[PDB]
Every structure is written in C-alpha cells, then in structure tokens.
Amino acid sequence: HVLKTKDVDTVFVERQKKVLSLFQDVDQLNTNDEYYKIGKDYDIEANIDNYTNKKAVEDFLKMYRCGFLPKYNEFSVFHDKLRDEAIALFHLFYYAKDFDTFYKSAAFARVHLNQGQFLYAYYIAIIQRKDTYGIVLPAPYEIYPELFVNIDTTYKMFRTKMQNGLINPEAAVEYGIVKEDNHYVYYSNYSNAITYYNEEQRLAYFTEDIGLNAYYFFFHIHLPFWWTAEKYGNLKERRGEMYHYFYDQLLTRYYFERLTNGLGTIPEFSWYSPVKTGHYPLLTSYYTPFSQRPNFYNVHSEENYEKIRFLDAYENYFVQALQKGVFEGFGQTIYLNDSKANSFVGNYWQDNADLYGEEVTKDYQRSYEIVARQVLGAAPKPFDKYTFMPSALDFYQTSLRDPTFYQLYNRIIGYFNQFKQYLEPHSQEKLHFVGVKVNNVVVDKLVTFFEYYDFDATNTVFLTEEELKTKYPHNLKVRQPRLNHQPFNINIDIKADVATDAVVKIFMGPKYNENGFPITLENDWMKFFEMDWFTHKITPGQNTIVRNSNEFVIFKEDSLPSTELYKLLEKGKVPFDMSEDFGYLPKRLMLPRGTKGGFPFQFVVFVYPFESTTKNLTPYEKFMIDNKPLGYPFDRPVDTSCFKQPNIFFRDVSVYHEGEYHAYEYNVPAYFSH
Amino acid sequence: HVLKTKDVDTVFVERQKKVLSLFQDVDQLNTNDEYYKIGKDYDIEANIDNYTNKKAVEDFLKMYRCGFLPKYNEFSVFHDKLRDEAIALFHLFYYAKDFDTFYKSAAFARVHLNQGQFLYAYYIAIIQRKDTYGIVLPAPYEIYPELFVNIDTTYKMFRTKMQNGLINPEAAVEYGIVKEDNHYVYYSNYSNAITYYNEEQRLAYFTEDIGLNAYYFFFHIHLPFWWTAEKYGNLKERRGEMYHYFYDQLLTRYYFERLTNGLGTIPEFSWYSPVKTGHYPLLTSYYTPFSQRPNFYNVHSEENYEKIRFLDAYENYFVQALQKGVFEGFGQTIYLNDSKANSFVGNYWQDNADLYGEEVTKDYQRSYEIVARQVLGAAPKPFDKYTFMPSALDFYQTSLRDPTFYQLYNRIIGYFNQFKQYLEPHSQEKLHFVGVKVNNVVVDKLVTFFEYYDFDATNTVFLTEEELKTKYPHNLKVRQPRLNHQPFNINIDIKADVATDAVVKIFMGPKYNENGFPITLENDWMKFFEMDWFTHKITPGQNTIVRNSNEFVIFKEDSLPSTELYKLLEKGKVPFDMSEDFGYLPKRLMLPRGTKGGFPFQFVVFVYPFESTTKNLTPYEKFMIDNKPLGYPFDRPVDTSCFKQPNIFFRDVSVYHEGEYHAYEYNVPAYFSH
Ligand SMILES: *[C@@H]1O[C@H](CO)[C@@H](O[C@@H]2O[C@H](CO)[C@@H](O[C@@H]3O[C@H](CO[C@H]4O[C@H](CO[C@H]5O[C@H](CO)[C@@H](O)[C@H](O)[C@@H]5O[C@H]5O[C@H](CO)[C@@H](O)[C@H](O)[C@@H]5O)[C@@H](O)[C@H](O[C@H]5O[C@H](CO)[C@@H](O)[C@H](O)[C@@H]5O[C@H]5O[C@H](CO)[C@@H](O)[C@H](O)[C@@H]5O)[C@@H]4O)[C@@H](O)[C@H](O[C@H]4O[C@H](CO)[C@@H](O)[C@H](O)[C@@H]4O[C@H]4O[C@H](CO)[C@@H](O)[C@H](O)[C@@H]4O[C@H]4O[C@H](CO)[C@@H](O)[C@H](O[C@H]5O[C@H](CO)[C@@H](O)[C@H](O)[C@H]5O)[C@@H]4O)[C@@H]3O)[C@H](O)[C@H]2NC(C)=O)[C@H](O)[C@H]1NC(C)=O
Ligand SMILES: *[C@@H]1O[C@H](CO)[C@@H](O[C@@H]2O[C@H](CO)[C@@H](O[C@@H]3O[C@H](CO[C@H]4O[C@H](CO[C@H]5O[C@H](CO)[C@@H](O)[C@H](O)[C@@H]5O[C@H]5O[C@H](CO)[C@@H](O)[C@H](O)[C@@H]5O)[C@@H](O)[C@H](O[C@H]5O[C@H](CO)[C@@H](O)[C@H](O)[C@@H]5O[C@H]5O[C@H](CO)[C@@H](O)[C@H](O)[C@@H]5O)[C@@H]4O)[C@@H](O)[C@H](O[C@H]4O[C@H](CO)[C@@H](O)[C@H](O)[C@@H]4O[C@H]4O[C@H](CO)[C@@H](O)[C@H](O)[C@@H]4O[C@H]4O[C@H](CO)[C@@H](O)[C@H](O[C@H]5O[C@H](CO)[C@@H](O)[C@H](O)[C@H]5O)[C@@H]4O)[C@@H]3O)[C@H](O)[C@H]2NC(C)=O)[C@H](O)[C@H]1NC(C)=O
Ligand SMILES: *[C@@H]1O[C@H](CO)[C@@H](O[C@@H]2O[C@H](CO)[C@@H](O)[C@H](O)[C@H]2NC(C)=O)[C@H](O)[C@H]1NC(C)=O
Ligand SMILES: *[C@@H]1O[C@H](CO)[C@@H](O[C@@H]2O[C@H](CO)[C@@H](O)[C@H](O)[C@H]2NC(C)=O)[C@H](O)[C@H]1NC(C)=O
C-alpha cells in the first residue's frame, strides 16, 4: 500500500516551508527563529498599502489598539469577542496582497497574539487565500494535542519533560511510557478505559478518534459558519444543501457505530427535562478543567430559562413555517417548493452569514447552534469576555466527543428531514435508467480491527531556552490503537442495451431498525451512507465493474507528521490527499466496528445517466462533480413503489471484527511489552 | 434421547386417573362425567368424621355458607377474600382422612366453586397430601392456557371453535392456523413479534417461555407463602435460605439473558419516581383486559401514597436493623450472627407464616410483596372483594412476564445480599480440600437454538352439549419455538493424594460485568448459577469425571401432555421427572440464548469433602442432599484472596447460537409451510 503523491514547484515548496515554520512549538515563542524578528517589528500601519482592503485592516488596527485575548487563555470561536477578534485577524491575513505580506502578518500575529486565536485564523487563511491553494496543513491533533488526548497521557509527557527523560525506563513501561529510537512513545487509552459513567462510553474508540475529530475541525475551517460562501461561487446557492449532506452523513455513520454496539437510535431530548446522557471531558485548559455534564443533568434551571425560550422559539418558527407552507422573514417570503428553499433551511439552522446576505455575521444575530452548545455544555456562565470554562462543545476539534453533539444535530436534521417530505419526491421514472440494469453485486468480506497509530505530540511540552537554540525535537509520540478495516472489492454486474456515460454510486445502509426488524425505505431513506461516486462508460451488453474500497472517492488517507512532510518536500512532492482532500473522512473509518459474529448491513449500488455538471461544487469538495442534489437518490423520500428500479441493487453484507474487540487491550503493558 | 420412566402400582394408577379426571375442560361442567354426580350431592357436614381436623371443616362450612367467589370471575391469591376462601378449600382437601374423601371433596369443589379457585387449592393439595405423593401434575400451561398464550392465538382458537373447523384451510395457514392429523395447530408468537414498546421486549422469548413461567407457579404451590413449612420438617428452620437461593438463582439466570442481549444489570427503581420499564400484558380475563403499565409510569400518585409509605417503612426497618446489628420485633431479638438470622430475613421479606410462628397468614399481616405487586401492576383499585382488573403480577404463572418482577425481587435480594456481608465469610481454610486438586476442566461447545414445542391448549375452548357426551377432544395444539441447547460434556481432571468421598459442584458465572470489564468475586459472588451437584468417590492419583448436561441434577425434562400421561399409565408407568422433580427448571433453559459470534461466560467447578447430611432438604427438593448452605460456596462473600484454592477451577466458555436468532422467524408462514 503506497500513498499517492503529487508534484509541486519551487515556489510552492518555499511557501510550504514558511507556513510550517509557524506551526512549531506553538504554545511558546522562539526568539532564535527568523519569524520572531520579522513579526516583532512588523508595522501593519506602515504597510497598509500591501492589503487589498484598507477598511478591514483599519478595523483590525482599531480593534488591536484596544487589546486582544491574552496569551495562554482558551480560545473558542463560539464566544463573541474572541470570534470578532479572530475574524478581524482573518481579514488581515486574507487581504494581504501577496504571500510575503501574508507571512509577515502571520509572524506578527504569532508573536503578539493568543496562540489558539492565531492558529485558528492562520489555519483558515491558508485554506482561503488563493496563493496558498494546495498548501498542506499539519494534522490538527499535532497542533492541538491538548484537545486530542486525555490528561492522563498529557501528564505523563509533562512528567517526562520535567524529569528531562526517563529516570527508571523499566518502571515507566508499566504506565505505557516506552522509549523507541530517540522518541518517547505514550500509549494512550480512550476514556472508556478509565471511567465508565454511562453506556455511551462503549463508543469512545470512535467518538474520541483523532481522525474523526480532526474531520469536524476541517469541515469548519473549510467554510466557517460566520463567513459567506461567496469565494466558492456555486456553493453559495447550494450551501444549505451541503449543510444537510454533511450532518446527515455524519449522523448516519455515527448511527451505524451505535447499531453494532447495541445502542439504538440517536436519543431525543427536551429543553424542559433532564438531559440523560452526561459527558466528562478528560481535558483541561491552562486555567481550568473542562466543564462536566453529569447524567440526567437538570438543564432547565434559572441560568438557562431565557436561552431555552430562545431555542424553543427558534424551533417553533420552523415548525410553524412547515405548517403554513412558507418561510417568512430575513427579507423574503419563500414557499416550501421554492428553488432556494433547501438552501434557506440549511442556512437558517446554522444561522450563517449567507442567511443574511452579508460577508460576516454580527454579534446580535443570535445562533441556535451556539446557544444550544452553551446550555448542553453545562458550563457556568463566563467569568468575563476573555475567561470561560470550556466544554467539549466549545471546539470543533472536540465536539464529536460529546454524546449531546449528535443529539443536537440529529434534532436539527430531524427538522430538515421533516421539511424534505413537503418537497416533490423522486418519481420512479426519473430514477429509472432505460437500458441499464444491475444484475448482481458481490461484496468481499468486510472486516474491522484495531491497529496502532502514532502522531507527534511534542507541542504538548515546553522547550528549554537551550533547546530553542537547536532544531525542534519532534521527540514525543502518542500511540493509540485506531479503528481500521481490510480493503475490500465490490463487483458490479451490469446488463446494458445501449452505450452511454453513466454515474454509479455506492451506499451503505442498515438492514434492520434498532429493534431488529426490517428497514423501510419510507422511513429510513435518510439512513444511507454515501461511500462512492464515479463516472463510467457503459458498453452495450455485459459490463463488469470492480471498485476497491481504497478507491472510494469519499475518503482520504491518514495525515503524515510534519517531519515526513519535510522529507517529502525535498523530493518536490506533497501527499495527494493531504493537499486536495484534507476535508474527507479518513478511509480507515468508513466501516463501523463489526462484531465477532458479523453485524448486518446492506450495500446498494445505483447507476444513473451522466449529464449536467454546470453547478458542481468541485472548488469545495472534489467528488461533487454533478448537478444532482447531494446524497442523490437518498437526499429526500422517494415515491413509494414496491417494485425496485432495475438500475439499483441491494446486497446484504456482514461486518466482522478481528483481533481484540476492545481497543484498550492493545495498550495493556503485558501485551505491548510482548 | 429416551425419557426416564418410573414404575407405579395399581393403587397409584387408579388415583392418578382420578386426579386427572378433574383437570379436564376445567372452565365447564360435564354433567355426564362421574365427578359431577359425586360432587353435586356430596354432603361435607354429614361426612365431617372423615377429616382429621374438624375445626378446619367447620370453618370452611361457615365460610362457604356466606358465599365464595362466583364462577368465571378471575381468581388471584394476592387478594384477601380470594386467598382466605382458597386456604379454607385447601384445608378441606388436606385434612380428608383418605384419598377417597379427598376426591369427593375435590369433586364437590369442582362442581360448586370458581374454576380458578378450585384448580388452585387442588394443585396444592395434590402436592401436600401424603397419599398423593408422586402423583403427576398436568402442565400448568395446559390447565391455564389463557394465562400462557397471548390473545391473538386464543382468538384464533375461538374462531375455529365457533366455525366448528376451518372454513378455508388454505387461507388459515397465512394466520398460523394449520391442521395436522386430527389436531388444529396454532403457531404462537411471543409479544415482541407484535408490539415493541421498550427494549425489554427483546427478551420476550425468555420471559414468556411457558416452561419458565410454569416453573414459578410450581415454586409457589410447592410451598405457598401463606403456609407454614412445618410439613417439611427441616425446611422450616432453613426456609429463609431456600427463599434466597430460589430468587438469587432465578435473578442470576435472568441476568445472563440480559447480558447476551446487551441489556445490562437488572434496573433499579424508586417508589417516588416514574417507573421506567412498562409492560403490556396481551392477556385477558373473562370480564376485562389485564391492566397495562406504560413506560415511565407515574407510580407516586394519590392512589399509592399510603401504600408507598408502607413499602418505604418496610425497607427502613430492614436497613436500620442491619445498621444496629439486630432484628427486633416479631416476638424476638435476633443479632445478625444468630443462627436464626438467615431464615428471619427471608421470612421477613416474604412476610410468610413462619415469620409469625403460625400455620397460615392472617389478613392484617401486611405483605411487602403483595403491596409492591399491587402498585407495580398499575391496576386501578378493585371494584369490590370479588372483582378486580388483573395484572401479570397477580399470578405466579404470569409474573415472570413483567420486567418489574425481576426489579422487585432484585431489590429484595439486594437487601438479602447486603445482610450477608455482615456474616462470617468462608475462610480460605474451610474452602480448601487438602489433597484434592482440579488440574483441568474442559467444556464442549455451548450452542443454543430454537425448537418447536407443542402443548394441548384445548381448555381455551368450550365444548358443545353433544361433545360433552363423548370423550374430550384434546383437539387444539399450540406450537411455539422455544429456547434449547445442544447437550455438552464437562471433563474434570482431578489429582488426589488419598481416597475420599467428595462432593463436586458446577457453576456458570459471567466473565465480564455489564461494561465488558472483568468480573470481581468480591462484588459478583452472587452471580453464579448453580448447575450441578453430585457426590463422587476420589481414588489416589489421577481421576477423570465426565458429566453430561443431561445429567445435571438441577434440571428436568419437559412435561408431557395429559393424553400421553394416560398411555404411559396403561403400562403402569409415569415420567420420572414430572413425578418427583416437577419443581426443577426445564433443562432446555439452563443456557441463555447465545450470540452468533459467541458470548463470554465461565464455568467453575468446586469440589469439597462429602460429610454431614443431617439437616438436608430432600423431602422438598431431591438435589439438596447436604448440610452446606444452599448455593455453597457462593451463598455469601468469601474472604477475599488473590490466590485460587486448588480444589476450584474456572474455565472460560462461549455460548453460541445456531439457526435463526429471532424465535418469531420460525412462525413466519412462508417458513413453516416450507
Ligand atoms: C488574580 O485575579 C485577579 C482578578 O481577576 C487578576 O486581576 C486582573 O489582572 C489582569 C491581568 O494583569 C488585569 O488586566 C490587565 O490590566 C493591565 C492594566 O490596565 C490598565 O492599564 C492599561 C494600560 O494603560 C496605558 O496604555 C493605555 C493605552 O492602551 C493608555 O490609555 C493609558 O493612559 C496608559 O498609558 C501608558 O501606556 C504605556 C504603559 O502601558 C506607556 O506607553 C506609558 O506609560 C503610557 O502613559 C489600560 O489600557 C487599561 O485600560 C482599561 O481600564 C481603564 C480603567 O481602569 C479603562 O478606562 C480603559 O478603557 C480600559 O478599560 C476596559 O474597557 C472595557 C470596560 O468597559 C473592557 O474592555 C475592559 O474592562 C478594559 O480593561 C487600564 O487602565 C493591562 O495593561 C493588561 O493588558 C494586557 O492584557 C489584555 C488582556 O487581559 C490585552 O488585551 C492587552 O493588549 C494587554 O496584553 C498584553 O499582556 C498580556 C498579559 O497580561 C499578554 O498575554 C499579551 O500578549 C500582551 O503582551 C504585551 O504586553 C505585556 C505587558 O502589558 C508585555 O509583558 C508583553 O511582552 C512580552 O511579550 C512580547 C511578545 O508579545 C515579547 O516581545 C516581550 O519580550 C515579552 O516581554 C507584550 O508586550 C490587562 O488588561 C485586570 O485589570 C485585573 N482585574 C482586576 C479586577 O483587577 C490577576 O491578574 C490574577 N493574578 C494571577 C497571578 O492570576
Ligand atoms: C351489571 O352490573 C351490576 C352492578 O355491578 C350487577 O349487579 C350485581 O349483580 C350481582 C350478581 O347477580 C348481585 O349479587 C348477587 O345477589 C344475589 C341476590 O342477593 C340477595 O339474595 C341472597 C340470597 O338470599 C336468600 O338466601 C339467604 C341465605 O343464604 C337468606 O338469608 C335470604 O333470606 C334468602 O332466602 C330466601 O331465598 C332462597 C333462595 O336463594 C330460598 O332458600 C328461599 O326463597 C329463602 O326464603 C342474599 O344472600 C343476599 O344478601 C346479601 O346482601 C344483603 C343486602 O342486600 C346483606 O344484608 C347480607 O349480609 C348478604 O351479604 C352481604 O354481606 C356484605 C354486606 O356488608 C357484603 O359481602 C355483600 O354486600 C353481601 O351481599 C341478597 O339478599 C345473590 O344470591 C348472589 O349470590 C351468588 O353470587 C355470590 C358471588 O357474587 C356467591 O358468593 C353466592 O354464593 C352466589 O353464588 C351463586 O351464583 C353465582 C352466580 O351469580 C355462581 O357463580 C355460583 O356458583 C353460585 O351458583 C349457585 O347459585 C345460583 C343462584 O344464585 C344458581 O343459578 C347456580 O346454579 C347452578 O348450580 C350448579 C352448578 O354449580 C348446577 O348443578 C345447577 O344446575 C346450575 O343451575 C348455583 O346453584 C349474588 O351475591 C349484586 O347484588 C348486584 N349488585 C348490585 C349493586 O345490585 C349485574 O349483575 C350486572 N349485570 C350483568 C349482566 O353483568
Ligand atoms: C436596516 O436593515 C437592512 C436589512 O435588514 C440593512 O441592510 C443590509 O446592510 C448590509 C450591510 O451591513 C448589507 O450587506 C445587506 O445586503 C443589507 N440587506 C438589506 C436587505 O438591505 C441596513 O444596513 C439596516 N440599516 C442600517 C442603517 O444599517
Ligand atoms: C398478644 O400478642 C402476643 C404476641 O403476638 C401473643 O403471644 C403469643 O401467644 C402464642 C399463643 O398462641 C404463642 O405461641 C407465642 O409464642 C406468643 N408470642 C409471644 C411473643 O409471646 C399473645 O397470645 C396475645 N395475647 C392474646 C390475649 O391474644
């Protein structure tokens, strides 16, 4: 298994090394590094001519002269002041006329501003600026290790750095601390191996997977809710569509993990009753432990009355719009069948900039999601604008760790899916592919297993004045057994009459509902996980297609550590996926953990005529190369019919799991010491 | 597989035919039957000299002159008036000087009294009277089909009888109605195939198994809570022990079923909060449907205020007694270490006759169990002393159907197990068998599966005047897939120093807790299901014991329908087990349904010195042939020690399940019509 690579020129390489020079030892400043001198004395005012937008720069300066979030404090985009500052900073980065002015602005920020705040605006700018297109971003877990690993292993790294090494390596092994080469390796367990407060803990290997969490972070920085989608041209008109697709797909995938663990559907809650599923983040900031929400949390308390009424009102509005058939307000009146209605509900639920026709949201345009994250996070109200007790719900990099995150968005998609039943359902004729028929589909054995995975966590530690004189160590390694599966083929048999360009899609869906009974397309159309999308020229007669799971376009390879990125740069290359598909879900997670006896699911292949791609979303996500609605044909209900189309095939499938069932078993000292 | 038989003489054979003559078409009277003429004119008063207790007879006559529960009304021993009348009836039967007087009294009852009331006292008298010892009892599901099969199938039988056969056999098949020979067979689903109101429904194949339920009914009539245990001699002093053992074992067996179904530990509840798991009995009486308790039932309502205070007080008394190290009241002072302590707590929790040192319980001796069943049953207060809306908790034959049954007794055994930690824990020395060592234990593959089981359900129907002139039809058969498992051997390897008489016990226990983590003997000693108990002579050197599951003494063969009993009688024979082990749990249920991949458990063999059997309980249950406390050595905690005793062995074991996972699949017309 070789990783696909891509060729880059000398300019790109030079810009790549520059951006990476600002992603090192992020919680500390190195006066020996070139960036410190540049950044410390950069005069934004004096170079105001090197920015395409003078107003944005002046607003930044005006804001900056008043002070920004101090260093070391936690930064969260869900807090007004912090967000506005971060956004002003983003504008300073985005409007730099050229890479050089941008780099200097970045260095300025790195030296003067809050590390978290800088990293946030930095990450987004690299994604948004045209001149940095293709630039490979370092893994978020490598940049925010304190957000991707529990305190028990963070504390072990702290103890190692404080002791300046291992004092008794033979004893350290019993605490998962091993030395390999010149690296210190830390075997890190998911939380279900240290605390089991509720049954949802059984899903910890999935909800705490660094790749899954990185995936949500990438989703957000690819296109922040506070920013307009203008830059992406077409996506703007299809933004709400993308919202639905992303969350439906994520919720459905999470649902599958629940199913193979016997946890049933995503729980429903009320803002007027205790929230059943609590959550205890084993994370910490530099000033406080993350807030905890005990099981059966009394959410309807005096501190949340007003917020709950707002959330209620927000839901009420939508439900009433569905009833009367029209969305009023926001400067327009949309009937449910309007051609922009789909984008409206999506933008409405997310309360994004595009809902208002602006480039950035304002503080007074209150958000359902932000307020809901606030009350579900269970944190006491902020001490002040710059100080708050964070919860898993305050970061896109830790959101998926909280069971209520899925419950919140499942509630939202719940309404979105209700809205979809008011639309014209897909007719049997529009779904039919005259001349095309799928005679059979055979799927190879589906097997999951846990496999060790390492990543650089050195950013967890603080370097010595002497250590800063020499090259960075990239000394610490965090090792966790992560979910994965064996590659598998899908053999498709297609009997055709005429020759035509066809599109073939591969989905994965449940076979039974939570109670073990047969699924129903009428109520379960939204439970199909899109796995593949590709064009294929169908020749008259017999057509045999073989798609290997490693080829599914929906997923990407694991990221490589910054150190391997450099070696690859010497060759004038960059990982293909890491550069162009950084937002895709890691392929090692395309399958939910199976069971020893094999858990029931079904694959489905659908092939339809290839045609218009005039309003595709390639500038956003590469695989979106058609005009059909995202998730087609499971994007909305379908005109109930008891006789399936010949161009769609459903194949039963079983997901088995090999090796140790529980991930923590691979971190038992007796085991890894062999 | 041949069923063990037993030889019986002419006297026995004649009495067996007499007792069975009163178990036919029980809801109807046959004036053509000999018993009718006998019973209709039998004069109890005139024969008073034929009973060994004249007071008992006069009390029955005095009571009977005021009236008894009318025919067709539902009978339940949990209602005062009904119980008192039944007990008087039981005394009339128990004190008959000889079988003939007994028979005539019974015939009198069958003609004049409420069917259910009669069957109840009849069943018990047959078990208690010395001259009827060994008499075979008909299966309870054959006598009370309307309490062992849901109404959907009962209504089908009614339809068949009203039509006097099938009007369209070909159509009837699609509804589970089939004709085989001269029988009408009805495929009957467990409730989870028709309504899935909560996750507990997943357990319906077990909680509704007719054998499991019959088992509870037999436990009761064997020795009612309202009767003293005097007749059984030693049982009286060890009654409490027997109470703990019966329920703990049953709760543990049920816990195993939850485990392989991902349902965790037995839920805990509060009398002051909504009861989470509801229950919908798909049963009916002749006047009303059974009462239903919806999920999240508001149990703390004005109707239950006083009852709940009584229940709370009952529990407080016990908790405080434990805290102060002594039980006070009920005519004595018992410190926790008193030899009479164990029986006191069991008799206290059951509020039985022996708690008071009386023959039978009185109306004012309020029962925790009866009141708890009253409020958990959720039925509205009784219309009057003879009329009430029944719940599954009003019958020993339907109790195991209701999830709260296990929650109630789990709560009670929880208190019993807390009491046991105040006693002297078995020391390692007493557990040690000097010179005996179990080197190894090997268990054959553990495999479960569903298999069709039939029983006579003709009592569900009413016969015609003409049909009554001829022999009873035994026309209707109920067919259901019931749990079962393949036979398996356990090879025990023992290394002895000298020769001795040893006792060997076999238990099945969980391997992991509900969260999937290792079990702990300090906290899970009460979770070991006793499977076998037998004496074996040990010779010096190497010993090898091979026990087949069909040999385990704790279980019994399934019961035979009454028609088969007659045929066997012609040869002067009766089924061995049905005769003297009717109270045992059906062996086809000794193993919980497994999983396709195999669910983890562990078998443990323990061998100790065979000695004293002075206070054994053979008169009650055959297998209780020792002096040791029931469930030894897991009858109480053990002096925690990380080093295993040589004479005890634990072996990991996996229970797989073959064929269809869901029982209802075997009742699908397309399936059984082949
Ligand atoms: C415990 O607990 C407690 C309780 O809580 C606490 O306390 C707290 O504390 C805190 C802290 O400390 C505080 O705060 C702080 O304060 C301070 C002071 O204040 C004041 O003052 C100021 C100043 O003044 C001045 O200036 C101005 C302008 O701007 C003017 O106007 C005036 O006049 C003056 O003048 C002067 O100036 C100068 C001096 O400085 C010179 O030039 C001369 O001298 C002249 O003359 C000011 O500004 C203020 O103001 C305010 O206030 C007032 C009243 O009072 C008013 O009127 C105003 O308006 C204002 O106010 C307000 O407004 C509003 C309201 O309505 C709001 O917003 C608020 O409130 C405000 O405030 C006063 O007066 C100060 O300074 C500081 O600041 C800082 O921080 C912040 C945040 O926090 C920011 O924003 C800013 O920007 C700053 O920053 C900085 O720092 C930090 C730390 O802290 C950091 O992180 C950052 O980064 C930065 O850094 C920088 O700086 C520093 C110093 O400062 C240095 O050091 C550094 O350096 C480094 O680094 C670099 C890089 O970057 C390198 O290169 C090097 O090398 C190294 O070295 C840098 O440079 C703050 O704010 C408070 O207050 C308290 N609270 C209370 C209640 O009290 C404590 O802390 C604790 N403790 C423990 C231990 O934990
Ligand atoms: C709708 O809804 C409504 C509402 O809920 C309902 O109503 C109800 O109904 C019911 C039912 O019907 C009712 O009840 C009833 O009533 C009746 C009447 O009463 C009256 O009367 C009586 C009687 O008297 C007499 O006797 C005595 C003695 O014992 C004396 O003393 C007197 O004087 C008299 O004498 C006379 O008469 C006689 C006749 O009888 C003769 O001998 C001569 O003539 C002389 O002179 C009485 O007892 C009563 O009393 C009472 O009351 C009073 C008041 O008024 C008082 O004072 C008293 O004390 C008494 O008691 C009381 O007490 C207490 C109080 O505190 C309480 O506990 C209560 O209250 C009581 O009451 C009167 O006066 C009656 O009779 C009836 O009875 C019956 O039943 C029961 C149960 O229920 C029982 O227990 C009994 O025993 C009886 O039984 C019977 O019947 C049944 C049915 O019913 C059955 O099941 C059984 O088994 C039995 O049977 C028998 O008999 C019959 C008749 O009756 C016949 O028929 C039969 O036949 C058969 O048999 C065999 C088989 O087994 C064969 O063999 C043959 O063939 C066949 O036929 C048998 O025999 C009851 O009780 C009520 O009341 C009502 N309620 C109201 C509010 O009103 C309705 O019903 C509905 N409907 C629908 C449709 O659903
Ligand atoms: C009054 O409200 C209107 C609309 O609600 C505001 O107009 C918007 O202004 C923003 C500039 O911040 C534009 O980006 C939008 O396109 C405008 N939308 C509409 C519908 O006009 C207007 O700014 C408000 N009045 C004032 C004085 O600000
Ligand atoms: C008052 O109550 C006491 C206690 O319940 C009764 O005493 C019992 O009497 C019976 C005689 O039938 C004895 O067998 C018991 O051993 C006694 N128990 C105790 C604790 O003493 C007493 O009989 C009752 N008195 C009356 C007049 O009914």
From Swiss-Prot, chains A, B:
PTM: Glycosylation at Asn-337 is required for proper folding.
Positions glycosylated per UniProt: N50, N189, N337
Major localization class: secreted
GO cellular component assignments: extracellular region
One annotated GO molecular function: nutrient reservoir activity
InterPro entries attached to this UniProt entry: Di-copper_centre_dom_sf, Hemocyanin/hexamerin, Hemocyanin/hexamerin_mid_dom, Hemocyanin_C, Hemocyanin_C_sf, Hemocyanin_N, Hemocyanin_N_sf, Ig_E-set
Keywords on record: Disulfide bond, Glycoprotein, Secreted, Signal, Storage protein
One Pfam family of this chain: Hemocyanin_C
Compartment list: Secreted, Extracellular space
Described function: Arylphorin is a larval storage protein (LSP) which may serve as a storage protein used primarily as a source of aromatic amino acids for protein synthesis during metamorphosis. It is a constituent of the sclerotizing system of the cuticle, and serves as a carrier for ecdysteroid hormone.
Similarity comment: Belongs to the hemocyanin family.
Assembly behavior: Homohexamer of two stacked trimers; disulfide-linked.
Protein name (record): Arylphorin
Species name: Antheraea pernyi
